[PDB]
């Protein structure tokens, strides 16, 4: 039953096992049904918190590896297991979002939240590819990133939580992925500037979610022009609402 | 091979990867050698993060437990946790019972290794309700006061074992226990007797010594002054590497 497994993702959610709140958003969204966007953020919560695991461990075993030959053999090995499960969540994800939320999706919020999404899990696997792989891998984030961008410059508003949020993760693709860090600054300079300039369409009820973006917006521009910082940020996995 | 597990172990513990490197040090265990104090420390690390997961798990899904549906729900996802949670308690004592406990050839890891089985009976007791608590409660008490009485004897009072020991029989006393008085009393005494030894320790010692005498003071704060935060139990890692 469907509303029996959105209560238990809610449940897993507040135990922080992750793990339990994606199995139950699969099913959910398995049942062909469309998401509410409560639902879509649970399925956004679990599998960002899934898949963030792999990437931080990665991101430190790879590290390891590099600090450094027997050792160097072990990291390397160590890494190859977590890129396989890394691989294994990312497929899971963009199976879901192509057989089923994608196509199904009859809002254009809904759809282009879910086209980000595309692009958020072949970054995923940009950061990890090499070789001929990962050209596909770079394309197919671009193209779900590019066909999100284009359908919210004309159905949503500037302040949109979901219109910035992928401003800010296409920007980072842009400045890390493609390593073009002018253009990633002038992608999130024109998103921020365009929600200062449209504040009027800012609804009182998504101040909080806007405004959270907007900073990290700023924060990355901080970053990225030298004025210091912690690893740059992207979309908080709840944009908008509950 | 044990020195290669180790690697793994340690590579793991850097990773965040606790089930892994759970897996890797039971795999040491299980060959019957000794360990050394660093594999100790990431055998205990690595269950105290795997345990761990479950208690916290345990207290949100209990806390949230207080419609027919919902209740049952929240009910049956307390039971799971606690199964994961016994399954884990179950691992960690039968290999202290099989190998570290009979094996451990000096006072500083006999000490470890009960008051290791006073703790995982310990985190048994917080979930237990019935005919068993009370078996669990006194496999506890049993495996802390043989650690104490041995670590009085035996090791210094600036000692992190013998403190950390402390700090969770007192903690013990407090909560499982419901005795306040007695568990105020063991804190108490356990900080006052390593204040008197301090000025003997090098630095690396003094900092892993005073780390838990830190824990032993804010309890005995929260204890006896009030306070809303949660008491401080021990360290994984309480001595050195």
């Given at each position: 039953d469907k509303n029996e497994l959105v209560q238990k993702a809610k449940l897993a959610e507040q135990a922080e096992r992750y793990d339990d709140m994606a199995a139950?958003?699969?099913?959910?969204?398995?049942?062909?049904?469309?998401?509410?966007?409560?639902?879509?953020?649970?399925?956004s919560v679990a599998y960002k918190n899934?898949?963030?695991?792999?990437?931080?461990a990665w991101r430190v075993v790879s590290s390891i590896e590099q600090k450094t030959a027997a050792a160097q053999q072990m990291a390397r090995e160590y890494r190859e297991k977590i890129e396989t499960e890394l691989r294994d969540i990312c497929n899971d994800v963009l199976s879901l979002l192509e057989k089923f939320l994608i196509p199904n999706?009859?809002?254009a919020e809904s759809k282009v939240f879910y086209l980000k999404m595309k692009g958020?899990?072949?970054?995923?696997?940009?950061?990890v590819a090499a070789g001929d792989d990962k050209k596909g891998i770079v394309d197919q984030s671009q193209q779900a990133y590019q066909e999100a961008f284009e359908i919210s410059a004309a159905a949503m508003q500037p302040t949109h939580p979901i219109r910035l949020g992928l401003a800010l993760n296409f920007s980072v693709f842009y400045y890390e992925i493609l390593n073009?860090?002018?253009?990633?600054?002038?992608?999130?300079?024109?998103?921020?500037?365009?929600?200062?300039?449209?504040?009027d369409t800012l609804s009182e009820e998504s101040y909080k979610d806007s405004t959270l973006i907007m900073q990290l917006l700023?924060?990355?521009?901080?970053?990225?022009?030298?004025?210091?910082?912690?690893?740059?940020?992207?979309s908080p996995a709840r944009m908008a609402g509950n």
């Open positions: 139950c958003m699969k099913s959910v969204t398995e049942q062909g049904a469309e998401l509410s966007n409560e639902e879509r953020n649970l399925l899934v898949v963030g695991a792999r990437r931080s999706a009859s809002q958020d899990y072949y970054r995923y696997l940009a950061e073009s860090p002018e253009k990633a600054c002038s992608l999130a300079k024109t998103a921020f500037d365009e929600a200062i300039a449209e504040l700023r924060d990355n521009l901080t970053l990225w022009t030298g004025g210091g910082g912690s690893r740059r940020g992207t």
